Design a protein around this ligand. Structure first.
Ligand SMILES: *C(=O)/C=C/c1ccc(O)c(Cl)c1
Length: 125
């Protein structure tokens, strides 16, 4: 289990060193998206929260295909505003309910260090 807390101030530096295997060691869900919302990384804890197979969602568009319930100003809108500005860092609660039992989560979106990369972190609430 990787020793990183959800919402930590330097999380983007800590996660910069992690291959897909170390990402699976996190205590919380972690998704990496490009600026368009395409899934670059998707860890085991997120698969546990959502039911999706982490290997099978890589390459899919999060907002268009995987997670349409986030296609809204309250989630996607915050994401694309942060991508456009280049300083994405926002935390909010949300309910995931597409083809799943509705699940309330806390979401932290933060711009990655890798430039055109953005983290979406998720934990249960
Ligand atoms: C609602 O459509 C949200 C669905 C959803 C949220 C988070 C993750 O990781 C996935 Cl695969 C789907």
């Amino acid at each position: 289990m990787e020793h990183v807390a959800f919402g930590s101030e330097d999380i983007e530096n800590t996660l910069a060193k992690m291959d897909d295997g170390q990402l699976d060691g996190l205590a919380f869900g972690a998704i990496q998206l490009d600026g368009d919302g395409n899934i670059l990384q998707y860890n085991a804890a997120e698969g546990d929260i959502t039911g999706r197979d982490p290997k099978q969602v890589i390459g899919k568009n999060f907002f268009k295909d995987v997670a349409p319930c986030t296609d809204s100003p309250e989630f996607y809108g915050k994401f694309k505003e942060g991508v456009a500005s280049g300083n994405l860092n926002t935390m909010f609660e949300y309910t995931f309910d597409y083809q799943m039992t509705p699940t309330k989560v806390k979401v932290h979106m933060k711009k990655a260090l890798s430039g055109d990369s953005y983290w979406v972190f998720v934990k249960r609430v």
